Amino acid sequence: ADFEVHMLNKGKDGAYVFEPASLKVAPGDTVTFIPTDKGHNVETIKGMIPDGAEAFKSKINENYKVTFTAPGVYGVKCTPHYGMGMVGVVQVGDAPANLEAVKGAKNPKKAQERLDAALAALGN
Ligand SMILES: [Cu+2]
């Protein structure tokens, strides 16, 4: 199944957001990160991807489709706006096994606030 996450200057959660900021998908599903506003990218956060995955990094303004295969929780960031909390969480599968590793990953304060909230939104 194919899902879409927008990269926005403004959304329901404030400035510089992925919308939705939390998304649960099945293994083998895809997510397209859409440059609805310009100036953003999407890339893997360090320490917030499960074993079996591959890190990725899109270019600014690239409409970027990722197939998520390895079960677990994934943090993603926009590099331009990481410091502003432009992050998202994709959960692949149920009962993610890498929660404690991803909760311990270090992030800018605004990013950590948003990640903690997305994780809790997901019931983690
Ligand atoms: Cu951005």
Curated annotation (Swiss-Prot):
**Cofactor(s) needed for function:** Cu cation
Q: Specify the protein name.
A: Pseudoazurin
Q: What is its main location?
A: periplasm
Q: Where does Cu cation bind?
A: H40, C78, H81, M86
Q: Where, if anywhere, are coiled coils annotated?
A: none
Keyword Metal-binding belongs to the record: yes
Q: Where in the cell is it found?
A: Periplasm
Keyword Hydrolase: yes or no?
no
What organism is this sequence from? Achromobacter cycloclastes
For this protein's source organism, the top of the classification is: Bacteria, Pseudomonadati, Pseudomonadota, Betaproteobacteria, Burkholderiales
What is the gene name? bcp
